[PDB]
Ligand binder design. Structure first.
Ligand SMILES: Nc1ncnc2c1ncn2[C@@H]1O[C@H](COP(=O)(O)OP(=O)(O)O)[C@@H](O)[C@H]1O
Ligand SMILES: Nc1ncnc2c1ncn2[C@@H]1O[C@H](COP(=O)(O)OP(=O)(O)O)[C@@H](O)[C@H]1O
Lengths: 365, 365
């Protein structure tokens, strides 16, 4: 069976690394030199605006998936008409737009931050009057790792935020600042029949809008049950197939949905070395019509390499650390790799302190 | 760093799968369509007899290794003159010839089967007179999985074995039949400085000359210490760098060396899902000048897929089995994949019985 992936980034790279031992053949749509090229059969550079050429490319394979949900859902709708695409176009359209995303949660009694669609300066002032400060003005589409946003701390920032983002295509959205204690994420995989394989919750640490550390399992039976019930709602309403990610705010014993990602997620990279079946192999198993793998997990921490990465010779000296270099070009703010480590004894805690000092010397956010 | 591998088979395929997350770039010498092609950067088809063209190919990369020890050690000697090759040419020359292999063991007080070089029919009769029957006449070079041999059960088989193999290039060798209870293998990795990372012993099961099942760890402190001391001798005498494999016969509490393989070995495929660092990643770490990874292991069984492989849909139903299809063309006697499974509880034993019944329906030896 041949699997086509829209995008040739690190997520497609690790999808192929996990799925290739299953006997599957992988092909990517992307530019030559992208980090997935050396682990996939072919890479084809086609502008996504040429819908007919993308469909003709997709029809060479048995199933299509994607690594970036910001692509046109009409393109996915056109591809899915002739070759199956997972997950669905409905999951893309709702996930790629913050307004539609939070409107969906509200329509299903799922708690999120207070949000208002922003289409004028007066609409922004009314949202600040109703739901207070601090707050954040975000673009509805595109923008990642905090880019394309303006935090409103005072009344003077209202007109400044509007001036920057007023002409952003596809609109803006107001978000009230959430009083939360910490952040967790729920990652799961749904097969063709709707069966869901759940991973334990992962507590995630952000640094300037980017995720830098993820630790699993996060033990909380109350929060885990509510997160799974939220995931079951999304899987059913989306007719979802593949790996799904939901990021939460935690305030007390109550969960607040931040955003969802209809794909394998950064907060699940721990599962490569922490679970019997990683989020990547199970996403591959899901879209290929296979039964999902067992997801029994052990305590492990993931550390992101942003901007730069410690020397492989320095990382290899900590012989328990599992190295996952993406072979990407180093650039400030860019995710170039991550590091996993099972935490069992004090030797694990010792190597964990040394690898964090290495990251601090190479990290550029 | 760029790593060149002579050969593009399943061993090179899994070397690249294990080393690519380390940030390393892999290139193979082999035919297009070999199963390592889709996971390596490039594959180049060069006849190994064209020594100058192979050296020019190898000089594009930072270090060279190989997956088949039956290649010319003079070729490796020529390549190593201009770009480092691991393991050494001395390890190749001794391992690739059964006579030189057993003569080496005898020169270091290492027990093997009784062996005599065979260069005439009278020499074979004298070996049978001295060391009895049953016995096996083998080619010194080439021939694998039992091919190119003739078992001598009676006096009538002496002239029959000689007639078949007399004109075999590079000679023949007599071997006395070993009275052994079972078979184990010792796999280890030596870095550039001579440090050895040891894996636990693996008990291996053969079926008609081919290995079909490997289980680790095999608990025997007495046999394990002797196997490690034998490995240390080979690593030092060979100036060895990389993963090394030694297969033993076991009769009581004493080890009898069967053969050695200067490479990653079939009896170590369990380490992909059983060890913190598999034999493949550690072979890559060794030749790349990196510090080896921790080799803490858990109980796991490997089952070989020979001739055919069970349907991926059938294998995926046993969600704890780790699937390793080589994406090779099915043919009687050919290794097309293997399956690993951690053994912890009775659910593991249950899925183990079901996967063995699947293999019996697809296996063709
Ligand atoms: N409404 C909010 N209230 C408080 N913090 C927020 C809010 N929205 C985002 N954040 C912060 O930003 C991080 C996530 O950024 P996000 O909005 O997901 O960026 P993007 O969606 O562009 O990837 C979170 O870890 C959180 O700390
Ligand atoms: N001298 C011997 N005595 C008993 N059994 C042997 C002997 N040599 C090989 N065998 C059998 O053959 C198997 C290994 O085959 P081998 O000789 O290694 O083939 P090749 O070297 O061509 O791969 C072993 O599992 C063992 O059962």
């Amino acid at each position: 069976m041949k699997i086509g992936i829209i995008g040739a980034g690190q997520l497609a790279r690790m999808l192929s690394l996990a799925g290739t031992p299953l006997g599957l053949e992988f092909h990517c749509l992307g530019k030559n030199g992208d980090c997935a090229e050396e682990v996939v059969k072919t890479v084809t550079d086609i502008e996504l605006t040429k819908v007919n050429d993308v469909v003709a490319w997709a029809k060479q394979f048995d199933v299509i998936t994607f690594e970036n949900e910001n692509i046109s859902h009409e393109l996915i709708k056109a591809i899915n008409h002739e070759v199956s695409v997972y997950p669905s176009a409905k999951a893309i359209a709702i996930s790629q737009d913050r307004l539609l995303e939070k409107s969906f949660m509200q329509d299903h009694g799922i708690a999120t931050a207070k949000f208002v669609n922003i289409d004028s300066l007066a609409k922004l002032q009314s949202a600040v009057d109703d739901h207070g400060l601090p707050a954040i003005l975000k673009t509805r589409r595109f923008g990642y790792d905090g880019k394309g946003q303006f935090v409103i701390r005072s009344q003077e920032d209202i007109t400044k935020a509007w001036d920057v983002l007023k002409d952003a295509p596809d609109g803006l959205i107001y978000e009230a600042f959430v009083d939360f204690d910490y952040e967790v994420s729920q990652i799961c995989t749904a097969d063709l029949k709707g069966n869901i394989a759940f991973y334990p919750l992962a507590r995630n640490t952000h640094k300037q809008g980017i995720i830098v550390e993820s630790e699993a399992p996060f033990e909380n039976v109350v929060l885990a049950e509510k997160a799974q019930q939220i995931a079951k709602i999304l899987v059913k309403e989306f007719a979802y197939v593949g790996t799904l990610a939901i990021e939460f705010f935690v305030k007390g014993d109550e969960l607040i949905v931040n955003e969802i990602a209809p794909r394998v997620h950064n907060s699940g990279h721990w599962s490569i070395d922490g679970a019997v079946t990683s989020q990547f192999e199970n996403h591959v198993r899901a879209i290929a019509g296979l039964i999902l793998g067992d997801t029994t997990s052990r305590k492990t921490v993931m550390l992101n390499c942003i901007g730069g990465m410690p020397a492989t010779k320095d990382l290899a000296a900590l012989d328990r650390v599992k190295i996952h270099s993406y072979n990407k070009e180093p650039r400030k703010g860019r995710k170039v790799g991550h590091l996993n480590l099972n935490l069992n004894d004090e030797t694990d805690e010792y190597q964990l302190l040394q690898v964090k000092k290495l990251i601090a010397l190479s990290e550029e956010i």
